[PDB]
């Protein structure tokens, strides 16, 4: 999270740390949907991952910290590898979360609606303060504002009808490496997932576009 402020400890209960170990580790974000799935990107997973819950410092261990491994990656049947297309995940946890007051679910309403550009959004997560920079220490949140198709116009893959614009083009503010798999939260409601966006961190980034796949996600609810 880039140009953010640090969020009020356990605010955010259902953030979910990803430590990701390939075939190389990787680090990501993602949110519990239940006591015992995590929806995150697609292109987080690797062999292992091991899920960090109600945690607000992430480099030393906490009394609320529950740890909790993978068992199943169950990525969305038309992902793409390289373009990020259908770029969401379900994770299903070994055992399940204790909902204690830094754990808790992040609700799902009844209605998704597509939500055209605009929109000012807010995105959480534990990832790069900046280009080059570490990993955040504490739980970062920004405030981020929905584009304009158009801004996103140089990712080649990019489509505005499956994924979000995010990130205004005249800031650095904007979600970075180890946010992916975070949710985008538009007015208390997960809206997007973060995808990916330039190595440079110049913004917009991608967001994975949640009301597509609501059905979907509704094999978990
Ligand atoms: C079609 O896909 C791509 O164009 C692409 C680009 C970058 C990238 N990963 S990244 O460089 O670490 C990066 S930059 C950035 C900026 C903002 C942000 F919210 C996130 C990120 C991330 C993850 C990947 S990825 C995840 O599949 O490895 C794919």
């Not at 140009?3 to 740390?17: F, I, L, Q």
């Not at 070994?94 to 830094?102: D, I, P, R």
């Not at 584009?147 to 116009?153: G, H």
């Not at 997007?192 to 979907?216: C, E, L, M, N, Q």
């Amino acid at each position: 999270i880039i140009g953010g402020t640090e969020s009020k400890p356990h605010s955010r209960p259902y953030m979910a740390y990803l430590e990701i170990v390939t075939s190389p580790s990787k680090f990501c974000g993602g949110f519990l949907i239940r006591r015992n799935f995590v929806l995150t990107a697609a292109h987080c997973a690797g062999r292992s991952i091991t899920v960090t819950l109600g945690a607000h410092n992430i480099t030393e261990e906490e009394d609320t910290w529950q740890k909790l491994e993978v068992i199943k990656q169950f990525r969305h049947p038309k992902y793409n590898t390289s373009t990020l297309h259908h770029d969401i995940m379900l994770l299903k946890l070994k055992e399940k979360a204790s909902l204690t007051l830094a754990v808790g679910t992040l609700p799902f309403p009844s209605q998704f609606n597509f939500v055209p550009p605009g929109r000012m959004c807010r995105v959480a997560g534990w990832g790069r303060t900046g280009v080059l920079k570490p990993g955040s220490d504490t739980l970062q949140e920004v405030k981020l504002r929905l584009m304009d198709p158009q801004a996103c116009s140089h990712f080649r893959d990019f489509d505005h009808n499956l994924q979000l614009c995010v990130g205004n083009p005249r800031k650095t503010k904007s979600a970075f490496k180890g946010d992916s798999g975070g949710p985008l939260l538009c007015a208390g409601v997960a809206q997007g997932i973060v995808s990916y966006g330039r190595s440079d961190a110049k913004p917009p980034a991608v967001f994975t576009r949640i009301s597509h796949y609501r059905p979907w996600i509704n094999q978990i609810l």
